[PDB]
Symmetry: C2
Subunit: 213 residues, 2 copies
Amino acid sequence: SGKYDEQRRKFIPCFDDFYGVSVSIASVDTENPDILDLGAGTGLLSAFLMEKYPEATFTLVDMSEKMLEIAKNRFRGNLKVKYIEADYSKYDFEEKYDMVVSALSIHHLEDEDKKELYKRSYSILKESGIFINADLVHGETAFIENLNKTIWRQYVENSGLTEEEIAAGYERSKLDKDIEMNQQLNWLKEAGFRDVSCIYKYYQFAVMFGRKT
Amino acid sequence: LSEIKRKFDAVSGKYDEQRRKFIPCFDDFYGVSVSIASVDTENPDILDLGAGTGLLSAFLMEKYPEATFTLVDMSEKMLEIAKNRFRGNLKVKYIEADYSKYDFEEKYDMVVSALSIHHLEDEDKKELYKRSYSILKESGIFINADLVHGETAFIENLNKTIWRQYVENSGLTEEEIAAGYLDKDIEMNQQLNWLKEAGFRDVSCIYKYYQFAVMFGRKT
Ligand SMILES: [Ca+2]
Ligand SMILES: [Ca+2]
């Protein structure tokens, strides 16, 4: 768990602000919010959010039972956490939430799935709530994509990781279907979200926010 | 520690420390502007618009110690601090003028600016972008590291509140803090659009941290 967090820090050159900004803007008018964490993985984003809202309810969704198993141990004995092994793109959510949040997961969906997930997220928020996606975004042109990737590879190659850990992470990134940030902000606006904004951006890493009011 | 020949200068150092106390994302704000400032020559011609005490230029000289710099500012006092910052260095020019109205005749590899353009009226912003395009060399780049307005009242309040928090805990005197609480800031997309309108390509927001954004465009 610690080992999974410390490794993640080595692929994410803006780790502290990336997760710190996502937590800072995650404010709702309940100190007991119901939070849905899409592609929760080992539950790192939900953990940062639990520091801010210790009495929140969390629903972690992930295809990986293994990741979720790490999350359950991370959250040992916390009865306010629910775990669902499923593809959150396909899952029929029937509860309503104060927050729908995600880190580094939505860029793996086909573009049509992204668009529809943004749309569906609006409908499963309570009559009030927020959406936060801290995710990878594609360069606006091929030159900007190359710029973003060059800087990120420089960081990864110098993060302390071995040649084989570097190459393995590069292999994992071949399934990415990232798209331009602005196109994703447009899909949130088109879904009905207001106060739509990119709050944080560091080359390909962006924290995107919307509010249902 | 710079890896180039600098002359120590007490005054410009003190101004640098205070700016870091007003800017919560200081390292990355300036760090990113320098990462993206890449052109082929090792002696680029760089224009610094609203250069102040020369801080953005000094960061850029780390990466390009033999570049030629032209600092433009309405303030002679700011510019004098810059001259003493770059004491000796023979390749810095200083011009006291409103960079938004001055007739630039040379061409540059880079037009850069930090925290200054948001003080211009919108029509002057729009027009500065058009004209910066004109005075750039082929493959030249435009960088503006600046304040942007929140997209809505709610996001504006979020940005301000975060900043005010930092600023009350960063070590600034209650004077300095109030000596800072002028702005015609506007939303980021509108500025990106204005760069595209002036002819820039590869227009992108490279970095953003609430109201602080580093915007980029290139002439090709
Ligand atoms: Ca299974
Ligand atoms: Ca004068």
